[PDB]
Paper text:
In keeping with its proposed role in neutralizing the anionic substrate intermediate, we found that H202A AlgL was catalytically inactive in our in vitro alginate lyase assay and thus were anticipating that this variant would display similar growth and cellular morphology phenotypes to the other inactive variants. However, H202A displays a similar growth pattern and cellular morphology to WT. When we compared the structure of the mutant with the WT AlgL enzyme, we found that there were strikingly similar with a Cα RMSD of 0.062 Å. Examination of the structure reveals that the orientation of the side chain of K66 is altered, with the Nζ oriented toward the ManA ligand in the WT structure and oriented away from the active site in the H202A structure. Although no ligands were present during the crystallization process, the lid-loop in the H202A structure adopts a more closed conformation similar to that found in the WT AlgL structure and Y246F and H192A A1-III cocrystal structures. This conformation appears to be stabilized by hydrogen bonding between R74 and R249 and hydrophobic interactions between K66 and L67. To allow for the interaction, R74 in H202A AlgL is oriented toward subsite +1 within the active site, which is occupied by ManA in the WT structure. In WT AlgL, R74 is oriented away from the active site, suggesting that this residue may be important for anchoring the lid-loop in a closed orientation in the absence of a ligand. Given the discrepancies observed between in vivo growth phenotypes and enzymatic inactivity in vitro, and the similarity of the WT and H202A structures, we hypothesize that the H202A mutant is catalytically active, but its activity is below the level that can be detected in our current assay. In support of this, mutation of H192, the equivalent catalytic residue in A1-III, resulted in a large decrease but not complete abrogation of the alginate lyase activity.
Numbering used by the authors: 28 to 45, 47 to 362
């Protein structure tokens, strides 16, 4: 059977009254993907922010950032209000990068291949709505659609190469996000090999969740441990939600590991104690205060019967927008 997204991705294009213009496409990024890490100089915990290095990093990736944020924004605006100019603009941006063969460099380091997988997830995740909307907005744009989908397929194959062949100690949230990008790409391109890789990566993650709901590789990030556990949830929950409607039920993998992880995270958010006791360090709660970092609640509560605690957590923070997940996460799960 052809691969499909969750049913919410088939929603008609909206007609909400809102009209921004079409900005120039960010220059397609065809350079080397060898970037400075924001954690440059850290010990093995890789949890010490280097402000100067981060500034350098953000500058290096600026065109990629602008592409990710801008193109998802255009798709979101189109799905909300249905102005053809926004569709045309979004497709012009994505097809420009596709034709240029952006982000395809074989010259990369960890930070660089992470930019490749992140941008792939953002763009394909947004494009998913265009592709499967009952309005069929791509019907009039066959050439561009083909160009864009072929580019996604090239990048997806490369992302599998980028994160394959690793031992567990080197498989962390970075791989989970890569698996989301590859799952998203798999459904856009109807590529079962990509689908299968993302599923296998989820299963690795599920088996990394220990008997208490902790991930050893995320615990290693010391004061950022809780933040990184929360950061693991969105791609894992998205992968499971996508796999489910394609006939692969991952909810019970390793004794319901995804639920065990989610419940442990939410315990830590209520009270940091157990993560501190587990890591021996006070947790940086900064990221746990950011509403959109709980976007994982949308696919999660589509998968599991959420108890009132989870439901209220979702209700209080809705709607969720997360460009790395394709934009409007609440809308595609309602």
């Amino acid at each position: 059977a052809d691969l499909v997204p969750p049913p919410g991705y088939y929603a008609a294009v909206g007609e909400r009254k809102g009209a921004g213009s079409c900005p120039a496409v960010p220059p397609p990024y065809t350079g080397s993907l060898v970037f400075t890490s924001k954690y440059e100089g850290s010990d093995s915990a890789r949890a010490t922010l280097n402000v100067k290095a981060e500034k350098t990093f953000r500058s290096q990736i600026k065109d990629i950032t602008d592409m990710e944020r801008g193109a998802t924004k255009l798709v979101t605006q189109y799905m909300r209000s249905g102005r053809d100019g926004d569709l045309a603009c979004a497709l012009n941006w994505m097809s420009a990068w596709a034709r240029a063969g952006a982000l395809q460099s074989d010259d990369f380091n960890h930070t660089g291949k992470s930019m490749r997988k992140w941008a792939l997830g953002s763009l394909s995740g947004a494009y998913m709505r265009l592709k499967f909307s009952s309005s069929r907005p791509l019907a009039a744009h066959a050439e561009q659609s083909r160009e864009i989908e072929d580019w996604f397929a090239r990048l997806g194959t490369q992302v599998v190469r980028d994160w394959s062949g690793l031992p567990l100690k080197k498989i962390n949230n970075a791989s989970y996000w890569a698996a989301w990008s590859v799952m998203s790409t798999a459904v856009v391109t109807n590529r079962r090999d990509l689908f299968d890789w993302a599923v296998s990566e989820f299963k690795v993650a599920a088996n990394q969740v220990d008997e208490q709901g902790f991930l050893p590789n995320e615990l290693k990030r010391r004061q950022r441990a809780l933040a990184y556990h929360n950061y693991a949830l969105p791609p894992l929950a998205m992968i499971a939600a996508f796999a489910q409607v394609n006939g692969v039920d991952l909810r019970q993998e390793n004794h319901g590991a995804l639920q065990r992880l989610a419940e442990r995270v939410m315990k830590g958010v209520d009270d940091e104690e157990t993560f501190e006791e587990k890591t021996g360090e006070d947790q940086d709660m900064t990221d746990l205060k950011v509403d959109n970092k709980y976007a994982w609640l949308e696919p999660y509560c589509a998968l599991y019967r959420c108890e009132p605690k989870m439901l209220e957590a979702k209700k209080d923070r809705e709607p969720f927008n997360s460009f790395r997940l394709g934009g409007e996460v609440t809308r595609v799960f309602s």
